[PDB]
């Protein structure tokens, strides 16, 4: 799975045990797994188990979750996006 | 993500922020991402971010979205298909 | 498909004919198929059909299923996890 600082999960609206897609900007690999919470303030992004074959320390990734909803709701939906820089600093 | 002329999104019923599959006819790669609107009229199909590893400028692709519904409705369901000629000129 | 000792399916809440993901720790391959029951007690994890191209005997894998539910329920959801030691001996 991928262990993710709980602050980051909150900012992106991603839940513990939720399915996530990881898109690796560095090497182009794309895979799906689930999220687990890391300690708040740790700034951890840990790719564990089999997924360690698809990402390495230092790689830049996008981690996304998807939900379903009816069409009218979808047409006004605004995703929760957290942007990062530096030492996995969340941009405000 | 993949930024796509709003006119194209309109024709295919694909929404901003909707999950999409991209199937590359040129190189056979297949991947899933989400759609973002590019300007209307621009003809843009821009493969951004990590996805740029799966397609190059000039590649021919199919971009598709999927929805769920009960079996009874699915039996008569009709998808929205847009067809292209020349340089992203919608016919 | 992947045939799996019914005892293992029971522990993980995975059903016969349910969609499953298999993530191969040994070779990094990731694929999706459906589960079938192998005899109870047998310890069998058998990768059948086309899937045999993605795993070999002795490979260590993770087998997972996913369900949907509303956000309100998902917030407290607890998955069913089974852990293994030695030769598929469930602990």
């Amino acid at each position: 799975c991928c262990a993710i600082d709980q602050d980051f999960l909150d900012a992106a609206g991603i839940l513990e045990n939720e399915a996530i897609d990881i898109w690796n900007v560095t090497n182009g690999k794309r895979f799906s797994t689930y999220a687990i919470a890391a300690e708040r303030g740790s700034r951890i992004i840990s790719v564990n188990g089999a997924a360690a074959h698809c990402a390495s320390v230092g790689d830049i990734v996008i981690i996304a979750s998807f939900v379903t909803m009816p069409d009218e709701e979808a047409r006004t939906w605004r995703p929760n996006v957290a942007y990062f820089e530096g030492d996995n600093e969340m941009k405000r | 993500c993949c930024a796509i002329d709003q006119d194209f999104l309109d024709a295919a019923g694909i929404l901003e922020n909707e999950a999409i599959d991209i199937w590359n006819v040129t190189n056979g790669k297949r991947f899933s991402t989400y759609a973002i609107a590019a300007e209307r009229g621009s003809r843009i199909i821009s493969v951004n971010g990590a996805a740029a590893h799966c397609a190059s400028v000039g590649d021919i692709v199919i971009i598709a979205s999927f929805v769920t519904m009960p079996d009874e409705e699915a039996r008569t369901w009709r998808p929205n298909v847009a067809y292209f000629e020349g340089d992203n000129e919608m016919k | 498909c992947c045939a799996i000792d019914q005892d293992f399916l029971d522990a993980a809440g995975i059903l016969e004919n349910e969609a499953i993901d298999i993530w191969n720790v040994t070779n990094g391959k990731r694929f999706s198929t459906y589960a079938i029951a192998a005899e109870r007690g047998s310890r069998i994890i058998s990768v059948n059909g086309a899937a045999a191209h993605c795993a070999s005997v002795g490979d260590i894998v993770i087998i997972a299923s996913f369900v949907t539910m509303p956000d309100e329920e998902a917030r407290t959801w607890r998955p069913n996890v089974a852990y293994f030691e030695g030769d598929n001996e469930m602990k």
């Binding site: 995703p79 | 519904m69 009960p70 | -």
Partner: peptide, 28 residues
């Protein structure tokens, strides 16, 4: 309404986060 067509939408994302640890042997 019953039978409405249901969309799959981006709920949220972490954009351009850096991997800090990658461990093949995770036993959780």
């Amino acid at each position: 309404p019953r039978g409405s067509m249901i969309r799959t939408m981006l709920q949220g994302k972490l954009h351009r986060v850096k991997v800090t640890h990658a461990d093949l042997h995770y036993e959780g």
